[PDB]
């Protein structure tokens, strides 16, 4: 999908997030561990408590990965290939979880950034995170 309109909107919205993307990524993860405790079984050795450095940094990683993705959004699978194989094959992460974290990440951006969350962006942002969580899942087996 992802028309020009969508792409533009997602870029413009993800820019205005900027350096706060990392802390949101962690806040997003925290919500996820609170909402769906089963995903904790994917992070055995991590400290999962509030604002844990391990959570906070992994969140900074998912944030920068995402910013990278939006920097060149017209080819996602080359950019994310190594993460494709990392989550897909080695870690074998069950595809429901990407849609979980996707939605928690939408709640998080909504809560912290009320003014930019007009419907058009909520739309193309959900499409965008769809397209990514797909590109990560399609090497599942």
């Amino acid at each position: 999908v992802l028309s020009p309109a969508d792409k533009t909107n997602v870029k413009a919205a993800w820019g205005k997030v900027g350096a706060h993307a990392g802390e949101y990524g962690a806040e997003a993860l925290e919500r996820m561990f609170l909402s769906f405790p089963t995903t904790k079984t994917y992070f055995p050795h991590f400290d999962l408590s509030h604002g844990s450095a391990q959570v906070k940094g992994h969140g900074k990683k998912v944030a920068d990965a995402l910013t990278n993705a939006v920097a060149h959004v017209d080819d996602m699978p080359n950019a994310l290939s190594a993460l494709s194989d990392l989550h897909a094959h080695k870690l074998r992460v069950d595809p429901v979880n990407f849609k979980l974290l996707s939605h928690c990440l939408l709640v998080t951006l909504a809560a912290h950034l009320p003014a930019e969350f007009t419907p058009a962006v909520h739309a193309s942002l959900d499409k965008f995170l769809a397209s990514v969580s797909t590109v990560l899942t399609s090497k599942y087996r």
Partner: protein, 254 residues
């Protein structure tokens, strides 16, 4: 008997199979708890794809490795065993296997095979119905059977949507999805819905069913092969049944 559903029709979209209008759809589950589709082709045989059958397996696997790891359901909750499986001798171009049952399934209102066509129905614009047990918008295996209506898309448009050019030596993988579909003369393509509905993980093995209104008969024109679309890429790709009819008849005779 071909093509006579008791309740004929009028994936992350609408069109719930409420009345059970696709009695030829079967649900196969792999050893690692994945649900995919299959298509009843006679009272003892079903069609599916080789890739579906090769799930939870190495690329170098035989028939006796794969056979005991499968689980198969027909109708609503009726368990059905398996006598044997016959893979197509070629799998780089014909992603297809046939499963043969030990006994004949009882035929009724809820379980009935779709007919194999004698005509080529894959003309651009014809809208067919694909029913499936695959994953929904939450990327979870659907709780109820659903179906969508999709139109057949231009083959060249599809080739361009996946591959740089239609000319062989200029092609480069440009699939918005990591895994590349198999495209050749044995396949055709079909666009997604118009209310933005498409197929996704687990829909492979389902029939591209065409309802022929002159005779009121439903025909399996394609078998969905590349099931990794998620309304993110543009077209699903189906194997042309006309191009494997002879192999099917031979396998059935044998």
């Amino acid at each position: 008997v071909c093509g006579k559903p008791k309740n004929p029709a009028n994936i992350l979209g609408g069109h719930l199979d409420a009345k059970g209008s696709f009695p030829w759809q079967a649900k196969m589950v792999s050893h690692h708890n994945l649900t995919t589709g299959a298509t009843l082709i006679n009272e003892q045989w079903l069609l599916t794809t080789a890739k579906n059958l090769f799930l939870n397996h190495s690329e170098n696997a035989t028939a006796k490795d794969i056979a005991p790891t499968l689980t198969l359901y027909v109708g609503k909750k009726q368990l059905v065993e398996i006598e044997k499986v016959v893979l197509h001798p070629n799998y780089s171009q014909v992603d297809i296997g046939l499963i043969k049952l030990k006994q004949k399934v009882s035929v009724n209102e809820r379980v009935m095979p779709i007919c194999l066509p004698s005509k080529d129905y894959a003309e651009v614009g014809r809208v067919g119905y694909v029913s499936g047990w695959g994953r929904n918008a939450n990327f979870k295996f659907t709780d109820h059977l659903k179906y969508v209506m999709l139109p057949v898309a231009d083959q060249d448009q599809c080739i361009r949507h996946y591959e740089g050019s239609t000319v062989p030596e200029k092609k480069t993988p440009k699939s918005p999805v990591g895994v590349q579909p198999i495209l050749n003369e044995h396949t055709f393509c079909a666009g997604m819905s118009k209310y933005q509905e498409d197929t996704c993980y687990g829909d492979a093995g389902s029939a591209f069913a065409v309802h022929d209104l002159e005779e009121d008969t439903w025909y399996a024109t394609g078998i969905l092969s590349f099931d990794k679309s998620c309304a993110v890429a543009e077209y699903g790709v189906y194997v042309k049944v006309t191009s494997i009819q002879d192999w099917v008849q031979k396998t059935i005779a044998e």
